[PDB]
Design a protein around this motif. Structure first.
Motif, PDB file in Angstrom:
ATOM      1  N   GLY A   2       0.736  -0.981  -0.186  1.00 19.91           N
ATOM      2  CA  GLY A   2       0.269  -0.053   0.330  1.00 19.91           C
ATOM      3  C   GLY A   2       0.799   1.299   0.124  1.00 19.91           C
ATOM      4  N   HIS A   3       1.484   1.191  -0.422  1.00 17.27           N
ATOM      5  CA  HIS A   3       2.373   2.629  -1.253  1.00 17.27           C
ATOM      6  C   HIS A   3       3.580   2.624  -0.148  1.00 17.27           C
ATOM      7  CE1 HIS A   3      -1.154   4.120  -3.559  1.00 17.27           C
ATOM      8  NE2 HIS A   3      -0.036   3.911  -4.665  1.00 17.27           N
ATOM      9  N   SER A  46       7.324  15.143  -8.263  1.00 17.62           N
ATOM     10  CA  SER A  46       7.184  16.320  -6.515  1.00 17.62           C
ATOM     11  C   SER A  46       8.170  15.399  -5.931  1.00 17.62           C
ATOM     12  CB  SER A  46       5.395  16.394  -6.524  1.00 17.62           C
ATOM     13  OG  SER A  46       5.048  17.257  -7.780  1.00 17.62           O
ATOM     14  N   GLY A  47       9.029  15.461  -6.447  1.00 18.71           N
ATOM     15  CA  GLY A  47       9.883  14.448  -5.307  1.00 18.71           C
ATOM     16  C   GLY A  47      10.101  12.827  -5.481  1.00 18.71           C
ATOM     17  N   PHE A  48       8.658  12.678  -6.621  1.00 17.12           N
ATOM     18  CA  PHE A  48       8.734  11.095  -6.899  1.00 17.12           C
ATOM     19  C   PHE A  48       8.316  10.994  -7.696  1.00 17.12           C
ATOM     20  CE2 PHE A  48       4.316  10.913  -7.898  1.00 17.12           C
ATOM     21  CZ  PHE A  48       3.848  12.405  -7.774  1.00 17.12           C
ATOM     22  N   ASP A  76       9.909  -2.728  -8.889  1.00 13.38           N
ATOM     23  CA  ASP A  76       8.996  -3.078  -7.847  1.00 13.38           C
ATOM     24  C   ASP A  76       8.607  -4.367  -7.122  1.00 13.38           C
ATOM     25  OD1 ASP A  76       8.232  -1.070  -9.953  1.00 13.38           O
ATOM     26  OD2 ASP A  76       6.145  -1.415  -8.994  1.00 13.38           O
ATOM     27  N   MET A  77       9.112  -4.470  -6.792  1.00 15.26           N
ATOM     28  CA  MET A  77       8.596  -6.663  -6.211  1.00 15.26           C
ATOM     29  C   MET A  77       7.045  -6.283  -5.499  1.00 15.26           C
ATOM     30  SD  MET A  77      11.392  -6.200  -6.039  1.00 15.26           S
ATOM     31  CE  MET A  77      12.095  -5.167  -3.904  1.00 15.26           C
ATOM     32  N   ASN A  78       6.880  -5.409  -5.082  1.00 15.74           N
ATOM     33  CA  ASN A  78       5.612  -5.001  -4.720  1.00 15.74           C
ATOM     34  C   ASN A  78       4.113  -4.937  -5.380  1.00 15.74           C
ATOM     35  OD1 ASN A  78       3.206  -4.544  -1.922  1.00 15.74           O
ATOM     36  ND2 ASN A  78       3.694  -2.951  -3.441  1.00 15.74           N
ATOM     37  N   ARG A  82       4.711   3.247  -8.644  1.00 14.88           N
ATOM     38  CA  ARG A  82       4.665   3.948  -8.533  1.00 14.88           C
ATOM     39  C   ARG A  82       6.429   4.177  -8.477  1.00 14.88           C
ATOM     40  NH1 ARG A  82       0.169   6.656  -8.093  1.00 14.88           N
ATOM     41  NH2 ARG A  82       0.872   6.090 -10.439  1.00 14.88           N
ATOM     42  N   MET A  83       7.744   3.022  -8.453  1.00 16.03           N
ATOM     43  CA  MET A  83       8.500   3.055  -7.696  1.00 16.03           C
ATOM     44  C   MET A  83       8.993   3.525  -7.167  1.00 16.03           C
ATOM     45  SD  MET A  83      11.509   2.723 -10.571  1.00 16.03           S
ATOM     46  CE  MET A  83      10.755   1.044 -11.989  1.00 16.03           C
TER      47      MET A  83
END
Length: 121
Positions: A2-3, A46-48, A76-78, A82-83
């Motif tokens: 969850g992020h 924005s920083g991501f 991103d295994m999950n 977003r990574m």
């Protein structure tokens, strides 16, 4: 699940050793530092970043789409979409490694994780 997001930028200096063949399947402190510079180039919103920017950067690096798609699914295994800079820290090495003439499954070695998860039984 969850992020998550931790843009941790910590580095002393980046020395050019010209010997990145000892840390093939491990994340060096150099790689730790590198993830920030590459993240800078990822054009963060924005920083991501996001999986859309992820595919863009790696593809733009001169990798085939099948390879690109494989790398993202490995990053991103999950599969957070977003990574975070954490996942990117292990993902960035793949592009370089595969451009050295390599390939790998959907599971990274524990040395590359550095922090093994208890997700087995």
């Amino acid at each position: 699940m969850g992020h998550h997001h931790h843009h941790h930028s910590h580095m002393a200096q980046f020395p050019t050793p010209f010997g990145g063949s000892l840390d093939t399947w491990a994340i060096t402190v150099e790689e730790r530092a590198k993830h920030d510079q590459q993240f800078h180039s990822l054009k963060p919103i924005s920083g991501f970043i996001t999986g859309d920017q992820a595919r863009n950067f790696f593809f733009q690096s001169g990798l085939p789409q099948p390879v690109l798609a494989q790398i993202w699914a490995l990053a991103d295994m999950n599969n957070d979409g977003r990574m975070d800079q954490v996942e990117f820290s292990i993902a960035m090495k793949l592009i370089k490694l595969k451009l050295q003439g390599y390939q790998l499954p959907s599971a990274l070695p524990p040395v590359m994780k550095q922090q093994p998860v208890a997700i087995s039984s």
